[PDB]
Design brief:
This is part of a larger assembly, with chains A (about 100 residues), B (about 120 residues), C (about 90 residues), D (about 140 residues) and E (about 120 residues).
Chain A (H helix, E strand, L loop, with lengths): L3 H6 L2 H4 L6 E10 L3 E5 L6 E4 L13 E8 L3 E2 L8 E2 L4 E4 L6
Antiparallel strand pairs in A: 1-2, 1-4, 2-3, 4-7, 5-6
Chain D lengths: L26 E7 L2 E7 L5 E6 L13 H17 L4 E7 L5 H10 L3 E7 L17
Chain E lengths: L44 H14 L8 H22 L11 H10 L7
Helix pairs in contact in E: 1-2
Classes of the chains: A mainly beta (about 100), B alpha+beta (about 120), C mainly alpha (about 90), D alpha/beta (about 140), E mainly alpha (about 120).
Bound molecules: magnesium ion (35 copies).
One magnesium ion (MG) binds next to loops of chain B.
Chain D binds one RNA strand of 160 nucleotides through strand 1, strand 2 and strand 3.
Chain lengths: ~100, ~120, ~90, ~140, ~120
RNA sequence: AGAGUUAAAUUAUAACUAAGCUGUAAAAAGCCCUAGUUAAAAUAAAAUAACCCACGAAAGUGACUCUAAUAAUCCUGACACACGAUAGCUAGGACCCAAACUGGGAUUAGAUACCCCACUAUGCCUAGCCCUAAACCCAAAUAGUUACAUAACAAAACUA
């Protein structure tokens, strides 16, 4: 049997460490016209805008390259008890699942 | 070095200049001062025009005198400098190099302040 | 008055358009806070009545700063919504 | 890098208007007070060539406040000045009042050519105390 | 950056003495301030003045100067159409931000929490 | 707390120049020994920095420089001791500007007010008093805890 702590210690999400400027692989599970909703698998999906190069190449099911900025978007604001969640993470688009 | 003397002097020719400096450091060495160094910063056109000894000056020579002196003294030298006919403005500052450099470790980031207002379910 | 003249607060109009250059100078003074100071200093304002100003200004600046930030943070989610009419 | 505004008093800058140095170009003092405006156009040599006031232009106690009046004074001022043959003017506005802009425009529209605006408005570094505020 | 609120407010803990005395509690509100309607100036004043001078010199014969007059009406039409255009212009907003309706919905979607 | 110093502005007072200048919602009175410009001491007050939050027991303290200098191996404590904003009082200086009072001018039914214009005690220094404030952060000092817990509102609740 594996102890949970072990599963944690050896996971990729742990191995990655700090979120900033990480190079990640992600997948497009939903599309609105300019906006592509990308699960890179972390917790929350990020959002992207379809680039000018090869517009029609990015579709639902497509895989993508991401530069992960922040694992999720949050801050505390004036006179707030708890901080405020966007329920998304911040990422940038590089290229599409360059293979 | 302990004290620093910013001499703004009436712009003259070389001999007269030499005279002025010489007698200045003489006065200091008489009040008990140990002179380290003399730094001529040039003759500049002053940032603004300075009126002293019934003469309104545009330009001036700039000098820096580092020296050690006893506490009691500084007043005396200031007086004898103010009296002087060719000093276009005197001053004496604690020499910059006594003041320590305490390392900026950097910016200690200030977090938003919480628990200002009570928790109230208002509206 | 002891300083050399015409170096301070001086714009020189380019391509002969005056109105533009005046707008420019105005933007200078108002950027540095001099207009608010002239206007402040037409009459007097007593020390107490001044700290009140200061504090109201600074509170208000804090509020507007924060609210600005919050707005520009929630900006993303202005995007047209995916899940509509679920 | 074109038109850096503040030309230095050193001679490193050669730019001529009517073949004159920037030091030699006429200074038009504009004074904009809440109830008044007055322009005085003076030589680089400080010999007054033109004077126009909102009152000297025949407006009266209130109405002389307005920007209308300002441009009005500006025109005739630049008339008197043009009479003595000044092409170009570096302007300085003193005070902050209604007829700032209006009068400056008034010099141009009045056929007088403007190079520079500089604002000398007295700004106390906390010298003399102002008169008390009003309602109280 | 936002001005430090640490030690500013009068509170039981604080060893310092007060800096800010807020009139209204410092909390981000949910809604946002409604747009501020801008006021007008006197329109056309220039051409008005020029045409005045003209009649003064010309003893008020309107036939003597067509130019000042036609330019005057040019300004009047520019003014009226500027008013019509600033009436339909309400899509203006901030020109690069969003109208205060949008901000207010959006702000109700991620409200600020005082309580709990 | 001393001692020394002045950048901006302002004022005397001259040189020119124009007849106005000031002043409000609008005016009037007021001043033309006025106004703009160019010069320029004293006195007074210390833009920006400060979106900082330091120093003092508090009052208070933010132009510059130097001298002196910020009690207590640190619990509480008076009717005792020493201080204590402004205003005020006594004597002597200072007087740019402000300004109770007062005199003009408007406004008004009236206007002993709000607006305008002058000008004074007074703000300034040196020495001596007076000892009051919404002297309020209306929240005592010194150690603690975030357990228990919402009269209301405000700056959340409590031990010793
Ligand atoms: Mg609340
Ligand atoms: Mg001068
Ligand atoms: Mg400020
Ligand atoms: Mg100040
Ligand atoms: Mg009262
Ligand atoms: Mg303290
Ligand atoms: Mg206090
Ligand atoms: Mg309140
Ligand atoms: Mg003393
Ligand atoms: Mg001076
Ligand atoms: Mg003067
Ligand atoms: Mg004067
Ligand atoms: Mg008015
Ligand atoms: Mg009269
Ligand atoms: Mg400030
Ligand atoms: Mg403070
Ligand atoms: Mg101590
Ligand atoms: Mg004790
Ligand atoms: Mg007292
Ligand atoms: Mg007193
Ligand atoms: Mg007096
Ligand atoms: Mg005097
Ligand atoms: Mg007076
Ligand atoms: Mg009366
Ligand atoms: Mg009545
Ligand atoms: Mg009223
Ligand atoms: Mg007087
Ligand atoms: Mg005092
Ligand atoms: Mg107090
Ligand atoms: Mg209070
Ligand atoms: Mg009490
Ligand atoms: Mg006690
Ligand atoms: Mg104690
Ligand atoms: Mg407890
Ligand atoms: Mg209730």
């Amino acid at each position: 049997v594996e102890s949970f702590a072990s599963m944690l210690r050896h996971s990729p999400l742990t191995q990655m460490g700090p979120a900033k400027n990480k190079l990640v692989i992600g997948q497009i599970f939903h599309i609105v016209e300019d906006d592509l909703y990308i699960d890179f698998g972390g917790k929350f999906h990020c959002v992207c805008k379809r680039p000018e190069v090869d517009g029609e190449k990015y579709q639902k099911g497509t895989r993508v390259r991401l530069r992960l900025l922040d694992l999720e978007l949050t801050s505390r604001f004036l006179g707030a008890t708890t901080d405020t969640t966007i329920l998304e993470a911040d990422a940038v688009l590089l290229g599409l699942q360059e293979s | 070095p302990r004290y620093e003397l910013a001499l703004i002097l009436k712009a003259m020719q070389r001999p007269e200049t030499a005279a002025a400096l010489k007698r200045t450091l003489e006065a200091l060495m008489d009040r008990g001062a140990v002179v380290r160094n003399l730094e001529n910063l040039g003759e500049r056109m002053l940032p603004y025009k300075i009126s002293a000894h019934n003469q309104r000056h545009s330009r001036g020579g700039y000098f820096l005198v580092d020296f050690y002196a006893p506490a009691t003294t500084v007043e005396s030298m200031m007086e004898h400098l103010s009296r002087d006919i060719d000093v276009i403005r005197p001053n004496i500052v604690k020499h910059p190099l006594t003041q320590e450099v305490k390392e900026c470790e950097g910016i200690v980031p200030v977090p938003l302040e919480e628990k200002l207002y009570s928790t109230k379910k208002r509206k | 008055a002891n300083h050399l003249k015409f170096i301070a607060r001086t714009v020189m109009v380019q391509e002969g358009n005056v109105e533009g250059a005046y707008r420019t100078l105005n933007r200078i003074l108002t950027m540095d806070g001099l207009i608010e100071d002239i206007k402040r200093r037409r009459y007097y304002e007593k020390p107490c009545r001044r700290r009140q100003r200061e504090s109201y200004e600074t509170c208000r600046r804090i509020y507007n700063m924060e609210m600005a930030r919050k707005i520009n943070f929630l900006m993303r989610k202005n995007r047209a919504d995916p899940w509509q009419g679920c | 890098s074109f038109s850096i505004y503040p030309p230095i008093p050193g001679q490193e800058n050669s730019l001529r208007w009517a073949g004159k140095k920037f030091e030699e170009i006429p200074i038009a003092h504009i004074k904009a007070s809440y109830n008044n405006t007055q322009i005085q156009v003076v030589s680089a040599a400080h010999q007054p060539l033109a004077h126009a006031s909102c009152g000297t232009e025949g407006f009266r106690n209130a109405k002389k406040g307005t920007g209308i009046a300002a441009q009005t004074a500006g025109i005739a001022a630049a008339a008197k000045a043009t009479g003595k043959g000044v092409t170009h003017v570096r302007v300085v506005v003193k005070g902050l009042g209604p007829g700032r802009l209006s009068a400056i425009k008034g010099l141009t529209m009045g056929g007088l050519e403007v190079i520079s605006i500089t604002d000398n408005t007295p700004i106390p570094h906390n010298g003399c105390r102002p008169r008390k505020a009003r309602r109280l | 950056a936002t001005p430090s609120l640490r030690g500013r407010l009068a509170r039981l803990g604080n060893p310092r003495r007060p800096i800010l005395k807020p009139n209204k509690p410092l909390i981000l509100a949910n809604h946002v301030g409604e747009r501020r309607r801008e006021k007008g100036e006197a329109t056309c004043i220039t051409e008005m003045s020029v045409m005045m001078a003209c009649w003064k010199q010309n003893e008020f014969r309107d036939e003597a100067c067509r130019k000042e007059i036609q330019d005057f009406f040019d300004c009047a039409s520019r003014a009226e159409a500027a008013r019509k255009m600033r009436s339909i212009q309400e899509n203006l907003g901030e020109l690069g931000s969003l109208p205060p309706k949008k901000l207010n919905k959006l702000l109700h979607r991620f409200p600020n929490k005082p309580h709990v």
